[PDB]
Amino acid sequence: MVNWAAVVDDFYQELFKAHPEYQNKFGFKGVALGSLKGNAAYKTQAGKTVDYINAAIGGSADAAGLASRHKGRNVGSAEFHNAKACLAKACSAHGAPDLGHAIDDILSHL
Ligand code: HEM
């Protein structure tokens, strides 16, 4: 099965390398990138991200709900376009299918 957990870890490395300030919105604010895997707040968030990806592939993702929740953290279209780029890099690094359509689905509600 596609190792989405590893893809998601690479995604967040890419995301926070390019936009370190995004990390401030999370419960693992301040934590060195090389330590995220040892952080409990990160483990939970990465698991939810993997779940969302499996839901988008499986046909049950609530893109409108996810978008609304990100607006509720003042995260919008700009951040998601950055995320789309980072996730495309992470997918390609693992020979995984691209998730651009799923991110487009979220973007359509932002
Ligand atoms: C590929 C794009 C992304 C996906 C699939 C994704 C997915 C998720 C998921 C599944 C949750 C949990 C929602 C829930 O518990 O109901 C979440 C929460 C969150 N996301 Fe994202 N996200 C993405 C990008 C971003 C970006 C770019 C930011 C920018 C800072 C961000 C900030 C947040 C924040 C602050 C929360 C709340 C975390 C908390 O409760 O401590 N997300 N995201």
User: How many other CB atoms sit within 10 Å of the CB of residue 10?
Assistant: 19
Does the CB atom of residue 65 touch ligand 1 within 6 A?
no
Residue 76 Cβ contacting ligand 1 at under 6 Å = no
CB atoms within 10 A of CB 35: 10
Give the ligand 1 atom nearest the CA of 75. Answer: 29
Of 29, 39, 75, best ligand 1 pocket probe by most atoms within 8 Å of the beta carbon: 75
Q: Which of 92, 78, 90 is nearest to 106 (CA)?
A: 78
Contact 106, 11 (CB under 8 A): no
Rounded Cα gap, residues 6 and 75, in angstroms: 24
Our answer on whether the CB atom of 87 is closer than 6 Å to any ligand 1 atom is: yes
What CATH architecture does domain 1-110 belong to?
Orthogonal Bundle (1.10)
Q: Give the method used.
A: X-ray
Among 101, 92, 102, CA closest to 10:
92
Domain ranges of the chain: 1-110
Which of 99, 67, 71, 72 minimizes the C-alpha distance to 86? 99
Which candidate, 61, 60, 72, places its Cα nearest to that of 110? 72
Separation of first and last alpha carbons in the chain: 31
**Residue 83: which residues within 8 A CB-CB, separation 6 or more?**
11, 15, 103
CA dist., res. 73 & res. 16, Å (int):
17
d(CA 63, CA 103): 8
The CA angle 48-4-106, to the nearest 5 degrees, is 55
